[PDB]
Amino acid sequence: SGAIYVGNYRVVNRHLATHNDWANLVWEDSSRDLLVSSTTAQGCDTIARCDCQTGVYYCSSRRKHYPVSFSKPSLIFVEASEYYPARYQSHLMLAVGHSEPGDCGGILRCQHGVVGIVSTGGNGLVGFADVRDLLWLDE
Numbered sequence: 165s166g167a168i169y170v171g172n173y174r175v176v177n178r179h180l181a182t183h184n185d186w187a188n189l190v191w192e193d194s195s196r197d198l199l200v201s202s203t204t205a206q207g208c209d210t211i212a213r214c215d216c217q218t219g220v221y222y223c224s225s226r227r228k229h230y231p232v233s234f235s236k237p238s239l240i241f242v243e244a245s246e247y248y249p250a251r252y253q254s255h256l257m258l259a260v261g262h263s264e265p266g267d268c269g270g271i272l273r274c275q276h277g278v279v280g281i282v283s284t285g286g287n288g289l290v291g292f293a294d295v296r297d298l299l300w301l302d303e
């Protein structure tokens with residue numbers, strides 16, 4: 165689990181969105197595994213606006229942060245789960261590293277701020293849903 169809180173927005177993995185998230189839906193994209201909901205309290209997280217390909221991610225299954233190199237956001241094939249059939253997930257960034265299904269929502273950060281959140285994993289690869297292109301999160 166995990167979320168990004170910026171302004172009056174809460175950003176979570178779409179497959180983990182709650183009833184309150186859907187009842188206060190702002191925007192969602194199944195092809196990206198992203199959902200943004202509105203909040204009453206103000207959020208103070210900083211979203212990165214960059215092309216970084218290095219950063220650090222939180223892995224709850226190891227209670228550890230790992231430094232990683234990751235690919236630029238792209239369309240990648242993702243095998244079926246109880247949440248989605250087999251499809252291409254867009255705006256996804258891959259890195260070599262550990263993950264478990266419960267690690268979704270862990271934040272990936274660079275010196276500029278929040279890059280994205282853990283969304284996929286398999287075969288020793290971990291994928292992050294990018295949020296750097298969502299310029300509207302900052303107003």
Ligand SMILES: Cc1nc(C)c(CC(=O)N2CCC[C@H](C(N)=O)C2)[nH]1
Pocket residue numbers: 179197242245247248253263264265266267268282283284285286287
């Ligand atoms: C081994 C492993 N690590 C993780 C993070 C996973 C879970 C995973 O990849 N999923 C399941 C939830 C929906 C995801 C999606 N975006 O389509 C796919 N598995």
Ligand SMILES: [Zn+2]
Pocket residue numbers: 212213214215216274275276277
């Ligand atoms: Zn950066």
